[PDB]
Amino acid sequence: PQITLWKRPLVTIRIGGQLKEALLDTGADDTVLEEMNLPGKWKPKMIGGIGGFIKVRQYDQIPIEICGHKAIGTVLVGPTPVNIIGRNLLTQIGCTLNF
Amino acid sequence: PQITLWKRPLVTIRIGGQLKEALLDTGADDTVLEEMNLPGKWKPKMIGGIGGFIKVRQYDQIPIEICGHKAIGTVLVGPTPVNIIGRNLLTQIGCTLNF
Ligand SMILES: CCC(CC)CN(C[C@@H](O)[C@H](Cc1ccccc1)NC(=O)O[C@H]1CO[C@H]2OCC[C@H]21)S(=O)(=O)c1ccc(OC)cc1
User: Fold this and answer.
1) Are residues A2 and A67 in contact, defined by beta-carbon separation less than 8 angstroms?
2) How far is Cα A16 from Cα B72, in angstroms, rounded to an integer?
3) CB–CB of A78/A97 below 8 Å?
4) CB within 8 Å of A17: residues ≥ 6 apart
5) Where does the Peptidase A2 domain start and stop, copy by copy (chains A, B) (predicted)?
6) Which of B43, B40, B52 is nearest to B79 (CA)?
């Protein structure tokens, strides 16, 4: 599809039994999801943006379905105000910027 | 151009005869540049990111040429981690997401 940017590029994602709305975010290196209790091993990390840093938990090889497209990779979980699909998964679903 | 996302989508922008590198950031509503001087009236504003809120200076109707595409719009100046081109200007240059 083609997503214009008149509004926030929010799309439906699935992670296990949770459907969430998430931003397709070219400015995000990594995917950052709102607090959720995912199974498996993780490692602590700090990520920085406008305002400073937040602490997140890094989970690897997590399958995520983004608008029907399959992805699998690292997801960072922590107290973000919005779910963010970053470049690590955007590439996997074939996403480009065009103008 | 078509821009893939295996690398950060950094582009050269022209603003006030200066060349800067800025990140095409679909997860940003607003264009926010690191501390710089711009002419004219500005308004104090606050904006929030992943790490909390910051103070910025809001400049309206500023020309920026992004990859040779002309925009004229609002530019926020303040302590962002990196120069970002947000949706307010991405829309002006006809940028869309495609997958
Ligand atoms: C370092 C570049 C940029 C920060 C500039 C990175 N951010 C992604 C942005 O797209 C966030 C994504 C974001 C969106 C909404 C809320 C928090 C974060 N947008 C953002 O801060 O936009 C601000 C400018 O416009 C405003 O509109 C939205 C918030 C304001 S991020 O959320 O902080 C972030 C995401 C992933 C990541 O992985 C290492 C590290 C940081």
Assistant:
1) no
2) 43
3) no
4) none
5) 20-89
6) B52
Q: How was this structure determined?
A: X-ray
Q: Which B residues 22-81 touch A at CB under 8 Å?
A: 23-29, 32, 47-54, 67, 69, 79-81
Could you give the CA distance from residue B70 to residue A89 in angstroms, rounded to a whole number? Answer: 30
Q: Rounded distance, CA A43 to CA A37, Å?
A: 14
CATH topology of domain A1-99: Cathepsin D, subunit A; domain 1 (2.40.70)
Q: Resolution in A, one decimal? A: 1.7
Q: Mapping DSSP to helix (H, G, I), strand (E, B) and coil, where does residue B89 land?
A: helix
Stated length of chain A: 99
The number of residues in chain B equals 99
